Amino acid sequence: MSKVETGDQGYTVVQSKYKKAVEQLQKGLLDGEIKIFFEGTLASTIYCLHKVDNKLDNLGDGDYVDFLIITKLRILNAKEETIDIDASSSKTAQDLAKKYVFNKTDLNTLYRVLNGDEADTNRLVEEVSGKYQVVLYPEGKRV
Amino acid sequence: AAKASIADENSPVKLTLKSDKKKDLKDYVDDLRTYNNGYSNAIEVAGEDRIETAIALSQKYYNSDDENAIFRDSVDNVVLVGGNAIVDGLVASPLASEKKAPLLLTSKDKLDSSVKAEIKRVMNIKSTTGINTSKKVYLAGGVNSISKEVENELKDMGLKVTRLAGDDRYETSLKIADEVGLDNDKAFVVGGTGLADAMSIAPVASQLRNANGKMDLADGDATPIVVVDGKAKTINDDVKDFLDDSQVDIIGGENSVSKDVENAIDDATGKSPDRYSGDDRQATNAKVIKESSYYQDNLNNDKKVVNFFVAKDGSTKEDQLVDALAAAPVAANFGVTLNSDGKPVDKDGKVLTGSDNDKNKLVSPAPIVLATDSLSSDQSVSISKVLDKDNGENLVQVGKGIATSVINKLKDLLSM
Ligand code: NA
């Protein structure tokens, strides 16, 4: 289970926001090992950090980088897209479902915390920028 | 950001959902997960002509990575019938399902190029000038429905070509039925005009079933169909010799299978035929769906009928029913996705462990609701009664021309 793959409990970062992630890693000093995976292939065990920098710098459409600190972290090459559901001209939950395929289980446990059945001990509902926010990743486009 | 499930590599975007109140985005997540389930579990498969629609069925459920597909890997056999020769392969649906094969169509004079390409892809044919004798093609129809040049060109690609043909419609039909086999002492009999009747029974006939009527996709056997001369007093000696010791189910009214024919079958089988027939084809289809031993008692799980199909009827041209021909092998195997090793796999293709994930428990076959322009109320009652408490999970439309009015009414019964 000590391997980063889809559905694993951990953190996910888009390739555009990787530097701030890996900066909180060097300052960590083991909170006082950082394992780096290139598309599931080994790159570093732990300059080399510049080698990791260049891979994340020239990531492609189907390319991704994984990290392992007790903690798991994946960095992938998806585009950023924020939808404010309180705003008009936004895609409806239907139009979002017609275009994208979503994971049903993640949508379930997200609702349960929101409904109050579970205490938000892992900060899935984050008080940030004055609003309540959640992050959702689809699994592909609907053909 | 947060400790959650990490995303897929091929994720197209990163959606951040923000709202001033937590109850608003809780409702949006509720709405999203509902319409995500519906859009992912209601699909249409069709093509431009009768040939392409058969091609479309093969592409999606045979040798495809699609989840809920029948076979993840390539196949070895392909069933071929004449284009408008609906009557020269009308009973070929159980053959295609038994042979683990798709049912494709071809013209009479020349082998269509689109068919030629389709045979290569579903069979993983590497070269068209070498030899591919590990692959078989069955020709349903005589020289006047599939001519000699088609079978010669098919052999030019190094393909095995087996022709099932007779001197008329009824003889050729017996060749196809004998190819399927009477491996359960149970058969379906239709008349020379009951083309819509055989389409209603094809999906359950194509079901690979246990001797106990249960589902078995590794050892189960299909049920053949026979079309006879219903406009007569007795039945042909060829029909008598095929239907031996069988519990025959007549599908169709007395205008296509007369009471004289029914009593002749009673006199030729030793058992009273179990007639399933309404006043028209749609009422006959409703009784087929309603039957408990057809789609309910076969299941190995605690749930009831969940998955459903829908195709056209021949109320207008009588040649539309070819789409229900190619759909029947797929609907009879819906529920689980198997690799070339016969093991149940997930979306990514990894095998499923644990006795809970038995492929005979995960499978749930689907009837074909025969409806071109309207849905009979008798069908609606059957679909509702056979549905499980937790509701349905799949609906597949086959072919072009089915009214959406039938489609969304189905979605209400299945509650998708
Ligand atoms: Na058989």
Author numbering:
A (entry chain A): 4 to 35, 39 to 52, 68 to 90, 243 to 316
B (entry chain B): 1 to 416
Sentences from the paper on this structure:
Of particular interest in this context, is the role of the S-layer in disease. Assembly of the paracrystalline array relies on tiling of SLPH triangular prisms on the cell wall, interlocked by SLPL ridges facing the environment.
An insertion of five-nucleotides was observed in a second variant, FM2.5slpA249insCTTAG (subsequently referred to as FM2.5varB; 249-253insCTTAG), resulting in the modification of 13 amino acids within the mature protein. Although crystals were obtained for all strains, only SlpAvarB crystals were of sufficient quality for X-ray diffraction data collection and structural determination by molecular replacement, using previous SlpA structures as models. The 13 altered residues in α2L in SlpAvarB result in disruption of the α-helix secondary structure and introduce disorder in the upstream loop that links the preceding β-strand (β3L) and α2L. Unlike in the previously determined structures, neighbouring D1 domains in the SlpAvarB structure are too far apart to mediate contacts (> 12 Å).
